[PDB]
Design an enzyme around this catalytic site. Structure first.
Site, PDB file in Angstrom:
ATOM      1  N   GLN A   1     -14.469  -3.070   2.436  1.00  0.00           N
ATOM      2  CA  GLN A   1     -14.233  -2.796   1.013  1.00  0.00           C
ATOM      3  C   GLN A   1     -14.416  -4.017   0.106  1.00  0.00           C
ATOM      4  OE1 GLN A   1      -9.879  -2.081   1.986  1.00  0.00           O
ATOM      5  NE2 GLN A   1      -9.637  -2.825  -0.125  1.00  0.00           N
TER       6      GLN A   1
ATOM      7  N   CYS B   1      -9.420   0.877  -0.889  1.00  0.00           N
ATOM      8  CA  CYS B   1      -9.045   1.345   0.448  1.00  0.00           C
ATOM      9  C   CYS B   1      -8.723   2.846   0.442  1.00  0.00           C
ATOM     10  CB  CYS B   1      -7.898   0.510   1.002  1.00  0.00           C
ATOM     11  SG  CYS B   1      -6.414   0.476  -0.043  1.00  0.00           S
TER      12      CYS B   1
ATOM     13  N   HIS C   1      -1.809   0.117   1.170  1.00  0.00           N
ATOM     14  CA  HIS C   1      -3.140   0.121   1.767  1.00  0.00           C
ATOM     15  C   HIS C   1      -3.424   1.445   2.466  1.00  0.00           C
ATOM     16  CE1 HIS C   1      -6.727  -1.446   3.498  1.00  0.00           C
ATOM     17  NE2 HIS C   1      -6.237  -1.918   4.629  1.00  0.00           N
TER      18      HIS C   1
END
Ligand SMILES: *[C@@H]1O[C@H](CO)[C@@H](O)[C@H](O)[C@H]1NC(C)=O
Lengths: 42, 175, 65
Positions: free
Chosen positions: B19, B25, B163
């Site tokens: 990423q 994410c 995340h």
């Protein structure tokens, strides 16, 4: 410890184990792994 | 039900992506879950576009490189009627103008299912559905230099997650 | 509410991809700050500003005042 979740990360293959990480499983929701889980219907 | 599951063996998972320095994410976790479901449905593994989601899912609530949610991304694909492949809509690690082209749409969703907040339910979904989108607390140095073994961080939170990642299976070590 | 506390209070519990600072019991920024989504940690000054050449995936030794 003994049990783990196989997790795919998105920081390239250089990080962790080829881009993957074994997260502690059944350790009472460690790191919130089961707090916001979902999948799509197709 | 089984003691061990690894969807990589069954061809449900694409290679590891990167990423970069964009908080996308949530988009990688979403394309990850959709790649597995599309493969299960058609038998073909096709890498999906994270950039298509970063650029176009603002109306569903996403904020490009500043955050988003996997469910909003699943909602976008449904509202939009498609999602382009990686090849046709490359990842630039930055928010640009929406360049979605239906001609290159290779995926499609119908909605999404939210799993109950319990590890026992997660295991069941991973064993029966395929890879599952999840959010974890990855904001610790320990997670940064993880190399091998089972990761356990005493200061990890079960309530604050920063995340999005993808669960492709589970298991246990030898005896 | 301190600068750090007000910032934290604007980000939800489930926030993949958003940076949310960590504050200590006194409302100060912890010297070490981490952005979980991208995988980087760094040191900060008491005002939240990043300490130069401190962003990494390695070990840190950030200080306070
Ligand atoms: C933060 O504090 C440092 C140290 O005094 C200073 O150099 C910097 O200019 C300050 N930044 C702001 C925005 O006040």
């Amino acid at each position: 410890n003994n049990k783990y979740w196989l997790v795919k990360n998105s920081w390239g293959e250089e990080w962790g184990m080829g881009g993957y990480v074994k997260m502690a499983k059944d350790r009472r929701n460690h790191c919130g792994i089961a707090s916001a889980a979902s999948y799509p219907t197709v | 039900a089984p003691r061990s599951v690894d969807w990589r063996e069954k061809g449900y998972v694409t290679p590891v992506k990167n990423q970069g320095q964009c908080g996308s994410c949530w988009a990688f976790s979403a394309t990850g879950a959709l790649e597995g479901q599309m493969f299960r449905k058609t038998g073909r593994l096709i890498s999906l576009s994270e950039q298509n989601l970063v650029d176009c899912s603002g109306p569903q609530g996403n904020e490009g490189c500043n955050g988003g949610l996997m469910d909003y991304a699943f909602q976008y694909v449904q509202d939009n009627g498609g999602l382009d492949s990686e090849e046709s809509y490359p990842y630039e690690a930055t928010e640009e103008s929406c360049k979605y082209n239906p001609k290159y749409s290779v995926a499609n969703d119908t909605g999404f299912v939210d799993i109950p907040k319990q590890e026992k339910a997660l295991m069941k979904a991973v064993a029966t559905v395929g890879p599952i989108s999840v959010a974890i607390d990855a904001g610790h140095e320990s997670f940064l230099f993880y190399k091998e073994g089972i990761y356990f961080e005493p200061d990890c939170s079960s309530e604050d997650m920063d995340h999005g990642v993808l669960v492709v299976g589970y298991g246990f070590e030898s005896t | 509410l301190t600068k750090c506390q007000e910032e934290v209070s604007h980000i939800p519990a489930v926030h993949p991809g958003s940076f949310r600072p960590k504050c200590d019991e006194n409302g100060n920024y912890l010297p070490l700050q981490c952005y979980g989504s991208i995988g980087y940690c760094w040191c900060v000054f008491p005002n939240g500003t990043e300490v130069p050449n401190t962003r990494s995936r390695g070990h840190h030794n950030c200080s306070e005042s």
